[PDB]
Amino acid sequence: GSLTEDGLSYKEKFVVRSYEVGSNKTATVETIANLLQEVGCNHAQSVGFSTDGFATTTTMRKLHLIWVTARMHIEIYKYPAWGDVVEIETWCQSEGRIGTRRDWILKDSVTGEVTGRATSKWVMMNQDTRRLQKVSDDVRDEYLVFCPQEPRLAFPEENNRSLKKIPKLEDPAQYSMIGLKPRRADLDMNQHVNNVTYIGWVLESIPQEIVDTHELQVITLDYRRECQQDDVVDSLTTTTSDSQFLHLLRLSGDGQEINRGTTLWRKK
Amino acid sequence: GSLTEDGLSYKEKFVVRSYEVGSNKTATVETIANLLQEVGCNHAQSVGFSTDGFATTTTMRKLHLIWVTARMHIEIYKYPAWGDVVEIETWCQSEGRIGTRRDWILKDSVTGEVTGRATSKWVMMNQDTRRLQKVSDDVRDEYLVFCPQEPRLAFPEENNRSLKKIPKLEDPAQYSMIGLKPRRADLDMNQHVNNVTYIGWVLESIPQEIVDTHELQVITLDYRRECQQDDVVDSLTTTTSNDSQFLHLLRLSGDGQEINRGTTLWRKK
Ligand SMILES: O=C(c1c(F)cccc1F)N1CCCC1
Numbered sequence: 035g036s037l038t039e040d041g042l043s044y045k046e047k048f049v050v051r052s053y054e055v056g057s058n059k060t061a062t063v064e065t066i067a068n069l070l071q072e073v074g075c076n077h078a079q080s081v082g083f084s085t086d087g088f089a090t091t092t093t094m095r096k097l098h099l100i101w102v103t104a105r106m107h108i109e110i111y112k113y114p115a116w117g118d119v120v121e122i123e124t125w126c127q128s129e130g131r132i133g134t135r136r137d138w139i140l141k142d143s144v145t146g147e148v149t150g151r152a153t154s155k156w157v158m159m160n161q162d163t164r165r166l167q168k169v170s171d172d173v174r175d176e177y178l179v180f181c182p183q184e185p186r187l188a189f190p191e192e193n194n195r196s197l198k199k200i201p202k203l204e205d206p207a208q209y210s211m212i213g214l215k216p217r218r219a220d221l222d223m224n225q226h227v228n229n230v231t232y233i234g235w236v237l238e239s240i241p242q243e244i245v246d247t248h249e250l251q252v253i254t255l256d257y258r259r260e261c262q263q264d265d266v267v268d269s270l271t272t273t274t275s276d277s278q279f280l281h282l283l284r285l286s287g288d289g290q291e292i293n294r295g296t297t298l299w300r301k302k
Numbered sequence: 303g304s305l306t307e308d309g310l311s312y313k314e315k316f317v318v319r320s321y322e323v324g325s326n327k328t329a330t331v332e333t334i335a336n337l338l339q340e341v342g343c344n345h346a347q348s349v350g351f352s353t354d355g356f357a358t359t360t361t362m363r364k365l366h367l368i369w370v371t372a373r374m375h376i377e378i379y380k381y382p383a384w385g386d387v388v389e390i391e392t393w394c395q396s397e398g399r400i401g402t403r404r405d406w407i408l409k410d411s412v413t414g415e416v417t418g419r420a421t422s423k424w425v426m427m428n429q430d431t432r433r434l435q436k437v438s439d440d441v442r443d444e445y446l447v448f449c450p451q452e453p454r455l456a457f458p459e460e461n462n463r464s465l466k467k468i469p470k471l472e473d474p475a476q477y478s479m480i481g482l483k484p485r486r487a488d489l490d491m492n493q494h495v496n497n498v499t500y501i502g503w504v505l506e507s508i509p510q511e512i513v514d515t516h517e518l519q520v521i522t523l524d525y526r527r528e529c530q531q532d533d534v535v536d537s538l539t540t541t542t543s544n545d546s547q548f549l550h551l552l553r554l555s556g557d558g559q560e561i562n563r564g565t566t567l568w569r570k571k
């Protein structure tokens with residue numbers, strides 16, 4: 035991978051691996067999400083930011099401040115097949131004192147056509163107290179020189195799927211997958227659960243008949259709380275309708291919410 | 303990746319990814335195992351085999367026969383760091399009518415030194431009845447032209463740790479991780495649990511203090527029964543021992559039917 039000619043975005047090519055594909059011989063949404071996360075790491079390394087998923091500066095490290103994902107939105111038109119090369123382009127943009135946004139464009143290396151796109155909202159948080167805070171001007175100026183100055187949105191449409199309010203699922207849920215625990219392969223280098231695992235856990239409550247006859251087109255996921263290594267999760271789904279679903283991840287014991295989201299599927 | 307000059311082995315280079323590393327900022331043993339599996343797929347594709355992990359010929363497809371892993375053995379000297387390029391070389395060899403063997407050599411692309419090695423035993427099985435069978439001569443002659451004729455072993459040693467008999471763990475186990483279920487990310491393109499998942503499940507019963515102070519040097523794993531998508535697994539570990547050795551057992555949570563048995567060796571960091 036490498037920064038583009040203007041140094042305001044990053045591109046990387048990936049060959050789809052054998053263990054990265056689902057039952058339709060194409061990459062899973064979790065493989066796509068892992069690749070967006072990997073290209074985001076390489077963009078942060080290529081410009082001197084901390085490489086560990088938190089994209090910190092020496093100022094943030096001193097203050098014990100990290101960037102955390104608050105929302106992930108992904109739309110896939112064509113899943114790359116096993117052996118195919120996918121080219122992902124990523125860039126960041128400041129959203130004032132609210133936080134940062136990271137966008138992605140997925141393309142077929144052979145045809146050059148857009149096969150998918152993603153957007154994510156990141157917030158500043160103290161790693162110890164887990165207390166969110168507004169972005170300070172000392173921090174803003176450190177990353178602004180690596181962002182395009184004019185708006186560059188992967189999802190430009192005025193009021194679109196990526197910025198909608200997600201409601202809380204009402205009990206009883208139509209579908210559920212209970213007793214979900216993370217293993218060591220689900221943890222990152224800092225022993226925290228990888229944000230791609232939450233996507234897999236959300237999709238675990240989608241019935242197999244939907245997976246066998248439909249393809250996932252859109253997924254929006256809000257991150258409210260983190261799941262610890264020794265926590266147990268319950269995944270809940272209800273049909274709100276193409277097939278649309280409302281999702282909810284909550285701790286198995288007290289029922290504390292960790293995630294909420296929506297998925298949209300198309301008939302194959 | 304590509305077949306070597308003689309067409310009797312395959313090489314491929316991989317860059318270690320950010321989500322592929324553990325707490326030490328180096329590749330996990332499951333990432334290594336996934337890469338050996340990927341280079342094995344590409345070797346099978348480069349010479350005309352099925353590619354779905356079963357390495358089948360038109361003869362094997364007609365008879366509903368597949369190749370399945372019976373044993374996996376891995377020894378790692380240095381785990382590649384995040385960003386490092388690892389070069390893996392793989393080849394196959396016939397073991398008479400017992401089955402096939404697939405071997406691997408892991409090297410650092412910059413230094414050219416051997417950082418790891420693996421060996422695996424594969425058996426012929428009917429897809430439907432799940433009944434093992436000896437390798438027929440019609441099948442042998444279809445893959446023998448893609449194998450070295452003289453023996454080429456990743457583990458040559460006269461007395462080596464890849465061919466030892468593994469005993470069955472006695473209850474009560476010293477350690478255990480109970481209620482392990484596979485999710486959709488644990489399944490392959492044919493909806494079966496990926497062989498690498500069993501390795502992760504075995505390591506789940508190893509206490510965190512061992513993982514934090516030791517590095518995994520050797521892992522031997524026997525595959526006895528497959529875990530279905532809706533099965534639940536219990537992982538059991540007991541210390542058999544500067545080095546730490548463990549005896550492992552994977553069994554179904556209900557009836558206690560054995561699915562895997564193995565051994566791990568760890569050295570102090
Ligand atoms: O400060 C950055 C960042 C950037 F603004 C440009 C390039 C690389 C970076 F890590 N980020 C905040 C969270 C999302 C990424």
Ligand SMILES: O=C(c1c(F)cccc1F)N1CCCC1
Nearest residue numbers: 102103104157257258259260261
């Ligand atoms: O505490 C978290 C969080 C995390 F810090 C890591 C993983 C998942 C999480 F929900 N958040 C609150 C603000 C949005 C993210």
Ligand SMILES: O=C(c1c(F)cccc1F)N1CCCC1
Nearest residue numbers: 345346357369394402424445448
């Ligand atoms: O028949 C093969 C094979 C081979 F013998 C040479 C090259 C590629 C192959 F898939 N195998 C069966 C078990 C796994 C390897």
Ligand SMILES: O=C(c1c(F)cccc1F)N1CCCC1
Nearest residue numbers: 370371372425525526527528529
């Ligand atoms: O029943 C299995 C098996 C399988 F066929 C697929 C996956 C895991 C398994 F333990 N075996 C019998 C001896 C060789 C492996």
